[PDB]
From a paper:
Type I [name]-Cas systems employ multi-subunit effector Cascade and helicase-nuclease Cas3 to target and degrade foreign nucleic acids, representing the most abundant RNA-guided adaptive immune systems in prokaryotes. The stoichiometry of SynCascade was Cas8b1-Cas7b7-Cas5b1-Cas6b1-Cas11b3. Taken together, these results suggest that both the “GNS” loop of Cas5b and the “GVP” loop of Cas8b are responsible for AYG-[name] recognition in Syn type I-B Cascade.
We also observed a subset of particles within our cryo-EM dataset that formed a partial R-loop state, with only 5 nt of the TS hybridized to the crRNA, alongside duplex DNA bound with Cas8b. Comparative analysis of the overall structure of Cas8b in the two different states showed that its CTD extended in the full R-loop structure, with an RMSD of 6.7 Å. This extension was accompanied by a significant downward and outward displacement of 11.8 Å, 12.0 Å, 13.7 Å, 6.7 Å, and 9.8 Å in Helix1, Helix2, Helix4, Helix5, and Helix6, respectively. While the position of Helix3 is unchanged. This extension might promote the creation of the ssDNA-binding groove, which is vital for the NTS supporting and Cas3 recruitment. Comparison of the “belly” in the two structures reveals a pivoting motion of the extended Cas8b CTD, accompanied by a correlated motion and rotation of the three Cas11b subunits reflected by an RMSD of 3.15 Å. This motion leads to a reduction in the spatial distance between the belly and the backbone.
Numbering used by the authors:
A (entry chain A): 11 to 152, 171 to 237
B (entry chain L): 7 to 91, 118 to 373, 379 to 423, 434 to 510, 515 to 547
C (entry chain E): 3 to 301
D (entry chain F): 3 to 201
DNA sequence: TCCATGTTA
DNA sequence: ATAAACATGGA
């Protein structure tokens, strides 16, 4: 890796991909979300932004190549703070609903979901010099994030093989997802490793995106 | 026709599919033990063979008649009569579970059956398969294969995509924030038809104003399988080693209080069986994770309450094994399970349960606290299950000294003489009650940083050993909790 | 070349918002385990709704009404938001319609999908909850009336507390320059917020500005993090005064004006002379936001 | 077009609100925390009831009254005779059911919900109190003419404290339908506000 | 696509 | 205390 930078945030939420009627969350963000956040923070606009019923139709032909890991310093708890969020009905969709048709989003119904009390992340990116330079220009050029790479090292994550039973692992995770018919991502489960030493090469994952 | 299917545990996205594989394998194993099954095999040339059964993969070979037989066995059902203040209700047979529930009246099965109607098939349009196979006699050659042919056509190309229906008991057709549909595989959707037979069911409840348990919905427990062959060998006796004592019309063990309690109970039974059944690895080597679902029906709609993922650690199992020893645990001391969860490893040792234990106890049970003492409050937490330890012990000494000395100074009557003669115990005990509850209620309210310490004058009213103000003036909560709880230790014991 | 963002605080008063999720015969409020304690919170959706209500109250045109319906809560009186002008004041204009207005063939406007301006955070209390409780009479309506009576009368109870709230803006960018008048009106509406929560008419709590202080150059937010502050003290003052004394040359205090309403009463001269002669005027939030708008029209 | 709101206080005297929610032997008053101290409370429902009572007294049309002749206290004139055409202060009482006066649509086109013009708030003290303050006494029984037969024979306690307290209120601005005399009569009733207490 | 219906210890 | 605001696959 070239260098890595640290950040923290008080509140966040990471929905499982089509969790269901009742939402849920995961202790750590997905790799795809982190990749998108880093791409946007550099000021790189999305490669494709066509419009229609849906979006996110992304070929890999023109897209930066890069390798990302993930880290974690302090465990955080979870809470549930919501009572309502409307939806789009399935069924008759009778009476007025069919009468209005104004970007409908009618039939408000109650539903709850989860939030994270606190969040802090440490990992950065292994990338060529030009990409890091333009990322710095996007951050500084024409909540809070800053590089403390060498000190302040904490635990990390890594894919797990059928041995060495881990503790408090993440149930599911996403690598590269497109909102269409596909095979989604291959590996789901991940395992945390606790040691104040540089993460192993297995922790680094070369992202296809 | 001959069709072969191969499955790998690593490629499954959810633990539900992993349960489905084990359910299908157990279905085949149980079906292989029926005379009518082999009669149909030798008559209609039924093909059914497990090829490669190991820890990491599975292989199956089957024909159309095998699918017909499996759907005949799985979707078997009959009709039962119930009364109203009369009507017929169709009830599923239960499959291989009927051959394993040795409890009187198959009461466990009943709960399972109830659950199958509560959440599994809340939408009645999905009840069609059981309607057709009601009253059929597989020993008499009764069979049904109309729906089987469509499934066979679909399975002819299992790699094609499809759409998830409500047969998956989580989510909707698209969740419908917008029109998204969903993604799944035909072979993967086939596997979900049988995992419901492996899940565990428990009945949660809430406490009313009168303290009676009001049951609402169910809690479903799903295991995550690591070694398939070991799991399928051990479960048949795990189910058979369950308790049989029933409370009312439900098993006593079936009553749980928190969603995580059933997860601990299942793996506790597994740990009992691993001592009973040797030759397998540790619990982690058998179960990777536990899934807990809280569900309940409301009208023509189904609502969820909690979804979570647990861990199989045994040190928590050892602690949990202690709670069942105490008989008729009060619902307040029961909240000890809540505080079971480099920061929170040893958080239980401070017992900070005064707050939430008091919050609920205030409202409806300040009236009911005089009733049966909730079985002596498990001897008031078994009398703290017996200088910081000395700091805890001096509170117990001081409370007893206060109550005895005050009751003596009031009328100079001693329980030593009272126990000697009959017909005078309850008159003494009534004064004891009315002298303890007033002080307990006085400490119940008027609690803050400074005013609380001034009430210690009353505690030592009829009145080294001083070098602890550096703790008393700082905590103000642990000491308050101890003085509140230990004061109830001197509360009278019940007559019986 | 940015949009400034700040943090507001409210005068203490008893809490009003009951957040549903009622269990047995009590109404409760959601809590957060910030440091193992209890804290009352409010979701940003209520603030968004209240701000839009004040925008419609001030007379600014809009195309959406949430009216009290007899059957079930719903929102209506809305048409196609074809122009960005005359609608929704450049914010919160979602659309998920599958077939609408010939998409863009005759609409000829941007889809207005997944667009937002002035994304706001959520409010947090400053004092721990002490497990309070206040009971409630709640007698039956009648024993002889034609209308129903719920067959009995109960004795309820609810909990209240007095605690201030802090609240960040988080407004940035430079694209919101089409209607500076709309921006000024929105700023005035924020300065004139009252009854933001939908809690209840009685025991009403209102969000009045009280020592709103934050600013930055056209760089992303950092430094004070909008949270991690003490209660009923000088967190504003201690935090940014200490930082600016440590960072008088590291960060420009000329643009980042003064902080704290108490220092407006004492030691104002010393702080001003030691820091800078910048536009650090602080008399009232109204004129403060007026000069913010005056300086913001040029940028 | 014009809004108004004010905070008012009174003169010091012993406490007046009494409910006895704790126990028969010991009576207590509601307590609230404030900066580590404790203070007294008078709930807004009491002031609402008192305002209704003075609107009764000041010769104003009414749509609610009590009976004081039932085992469990209830209200009669609010719900029995009135279809809620015009409330005391346009409070337009609500309640939900399968129907309410023929779905409250055909006979009288009014919304199910209410207006809530008035805007009150909790009343809080200015200085703290401290624990029990006064004793009390109770008789044994009637004796010869046995009709009461309580047979209590106890010496209970009471809680009193001396404090003058204040409270705010607010009023809507653009409400002018049938206002001219109604709102000024309500204001005049506020001016006195005599009979409010828990006892 | 649309238009056929289900209740307790 | 009421107090309420969903799904299947079927020609």
């Amino acid at each position: 890796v070239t260098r890595y930078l640290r950040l923290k945030a008080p509140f966040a939420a990471f929905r499982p991909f089509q969790s269901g009627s009742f939402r849920s969350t995961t202790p750590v963000p997905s790799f795809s979300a982190v990749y998108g956040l880093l791409l946007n923070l550099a000021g790189i606009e999305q490669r494709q932004e066509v419009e229609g019923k849906v979006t996110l139709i992304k070929p890999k032909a023109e897209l930066p190549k890069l390798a990302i890991a993930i880290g974690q310093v302090k465990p955080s708890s979870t809470s549930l703070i919501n009572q309502q969020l409307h939806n789009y009905p399935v069924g008759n969709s009778g009476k007025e609903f069919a009468s209005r048709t104004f970007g409908s989003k009618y039939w408000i119904a109650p539903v709850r979901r989860e939030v994270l009390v606190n969040l802090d992340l440490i990992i950065g990116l292994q990338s060529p010099v030009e990409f890091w330079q333009k990322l710095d220009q996007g951050l500084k050029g024409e909540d809070e994030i800053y590089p403390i790479e060498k000190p302040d090292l904490a635990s990390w994550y890594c894919p797990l093989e059928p041995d060495t039973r881990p503790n408090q692992g993440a149930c599911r995770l996403t690598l590269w997802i497109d909102r269409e018919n596909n095979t989604q991502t291959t590996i789901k489960v991940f395992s945390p490793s606790d040691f104040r030493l540089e993460p192993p090469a297995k922790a680094w994952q070369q992202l296809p995106g | 026709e001959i069709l072969t299917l191969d499955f790998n545990l690593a490629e499954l996205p959810s633990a539900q599919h992993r349960a489905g594989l084990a359910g299908l394998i157990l279905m085949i194993r149980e079906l292989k033990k029926w005379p009518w099954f082999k009669i149909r095999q030798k008559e209609k040339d039924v093909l059914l063979s497990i090829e490669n059964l190991d820890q990491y993969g599975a292989s199956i070979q089957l024909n159309l008649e095998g699918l017909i037989a499996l759907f005949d066995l799985a979707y078997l059902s009959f009709t039962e009569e119930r009364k109203s203040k009369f009507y017929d209700v169709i009830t599923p047979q239960g499959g291989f579970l009927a051959g394993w529930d040795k409890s009187d009246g198959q009461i466990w099965l009943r709960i399972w059956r109830d659950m199958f109607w509560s959440i599994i098939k809340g939408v009645p349009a999905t009840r069609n398969p059981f309607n057709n196979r009601c009253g059929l006699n597989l020993n008499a050659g009764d069979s049904f294969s109309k729906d089987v042919e469509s499934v066979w056509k679909s399975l002819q190309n299992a790699e094609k995509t499809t759409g998830q229906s409500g047969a998956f008991y989580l989510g909707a057709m698209a969740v419908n924030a917008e029109n998204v549909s969903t993604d799944d595989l035909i072979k993967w959707q086939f596997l979900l038809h049988f995992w419901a037979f492996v899940a565990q069911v428990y009945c949660p409840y809430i406490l009313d104003k009168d303290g009676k348990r009001n049951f609402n919905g169910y809690v479903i427990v799903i295991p995550d399988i690591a070694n398939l062959e070991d799991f399928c060998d051990i479960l048949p006796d795990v189910l058979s080693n369950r308790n049989s004592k029933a409370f009312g019309f439900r098993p006593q063990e079936s009553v749980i209080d928190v969603p995580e309690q059933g997860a601990l109970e299942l793996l506790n039974l597994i740990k009992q069986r691993i001592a009973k059944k040797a030759g397998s690895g540790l619990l982690s080597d058998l179960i990777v994770g536990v899934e807990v679902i809280h569900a309940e029906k409301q009208g023509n709609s189904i609502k969820l309450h909690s979804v979570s993922y647990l861990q199989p650690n045994e040190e928590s199992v050892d602690d949990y094994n202690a709670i069942k020893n105490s008989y008729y645990c009060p619902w307040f001391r029961r909240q000890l399970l809540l505080n079971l969860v480099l920061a929170s490893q040893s958080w239980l040792k401070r017992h900070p349960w005064y707050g939430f234990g008091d919050l609920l106890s205030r409202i409806p049970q300040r009236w009911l606290k005089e009733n049966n003492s909730y079985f002596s409050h498990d001897a008031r937490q078994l009398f703290t299950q017996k200088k910081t330890r000395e700091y805890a012990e001096i509170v117990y000494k001081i409370a007893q000294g206060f109550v005895l000395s005050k009751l003596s100074s009031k009328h100079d009557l001693q329980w030593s003489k009272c126990k000697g003669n009959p017909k005078l115990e309850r008159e003494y005990n009534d004064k004891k009650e009315k002298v303890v509850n007033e002080a307990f209620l006085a400490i119940r309210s008027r609690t803050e940083k400074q005013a609380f310490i001034d009430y210690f004058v009353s505690t030592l009213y009829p009145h080294e050993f001083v070098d602890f103000a550096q703790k008393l003036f700082q905590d103000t909560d642990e000491i308050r909790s101890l003085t509140l709880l230990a004061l109830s230790s001197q509360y009278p014991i019940k007559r019986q | 070349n940015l949009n400034l963002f700040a943090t507001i605080l409210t005068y203490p008063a008893p809490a009003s918002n009951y957040r549903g999720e009622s269990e047995e015969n009590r109404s409760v409020i959601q809590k957060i385990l910030k440091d193992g304690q209890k804290y009352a919170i409010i979701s940003p959706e209520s603030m968004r709704n209240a701000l839009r209500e004040m925008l419609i109250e001030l007379g600014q045109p809009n195309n959406r009404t949430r009216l009290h319906s007899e059957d079930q809560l719903a929102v209506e009186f809305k048409e196609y938001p074809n122009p960005d002008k005359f609608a929704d004041d450049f914010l919160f204009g979602y659309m998920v319609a599958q077939t609408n207005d010939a998409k863009e063939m005759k609409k000829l406007n941007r889809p207005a999908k997944r667009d937002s301006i002035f994304r706001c955070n959520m409010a947090v209390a400053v004092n721990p909850y002490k497990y309070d409780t206040v009971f409630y009479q709640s007698p039956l309506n009648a024993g002889d009336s034609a209308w129903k009576n719920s067959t009995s009368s109960a004795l309820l109870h609810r909990e209240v507390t007095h605690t201030a709230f802090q609240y960040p803006f988080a407004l940035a960018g430079k694209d919101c320059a089409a209607k500076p008048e709309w921006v000024k009106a929105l700023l005035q509406a924020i300065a004139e917020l009252n009854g933001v929560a939908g809690g209840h008419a009685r025991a009403y709590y209102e969000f009045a500005p009280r020592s709103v202080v934050a600013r930055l150059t056209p760089k992303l937010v950092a430094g004070y993090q909008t949270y991690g502050f003490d209660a009923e003290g000088n967190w504003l003052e201690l935090s940014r005064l200490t930082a600016t004394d440590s960072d008088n040359l590291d960060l420009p205090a000329n643009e980042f004006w003064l902080g704290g309403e108490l220092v407006r009463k004492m030691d104002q001269e010393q702080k001003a002379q030691l820091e800078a002669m910048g536009a650090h005027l602080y008399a009232n939030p109204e004129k403060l936001f007026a000069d913010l708008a005056d300086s913001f029209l040029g940028v």
